Amino acid sequence: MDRQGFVPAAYVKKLDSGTGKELVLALYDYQEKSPREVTMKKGDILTLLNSTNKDWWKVEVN
């Protein structure tokens, strides 16, 4: 169900920090292209796990 992995940083937008975990908005549909990635749909609100790399951000997809 829930899956975790990397998506291209350009394809998500950070939401302002608030209560709990960091969140991003998925700007585009993105099907995972390699096992280390995950799939997202445009408009998904994703938990942001790691944004330390400029190219690849680790997210949770529910």
Q: Print the SS3 string covering the chain.
A: CCEEEEEEHHHEEECCCCCCCCEEEECCCECCCCCCECCECCCCEEEEEECCCCCEEEEEEC
Interior angle at CA 8, CA 18 and CA 35, nearest 5: 110
This PDB structure is determined at a resolution in Å of 1.1
Q: How was this structure determined?
A: X-ray
Tally the domains of the chain. Answer: 1
CATH number at residue 45: 2.30.30.40
Q: What domain range is 9 assigned to?
A: 1-62
At a CB cut-off of 8 Å and minimum separation 6, what does 2 contact?
A: 60, 61, 62
CA 39 to CA 35: how far, in whole Å? Answer: 10
CA 41 to CA 2: how far, in whole Å? Answer: 14
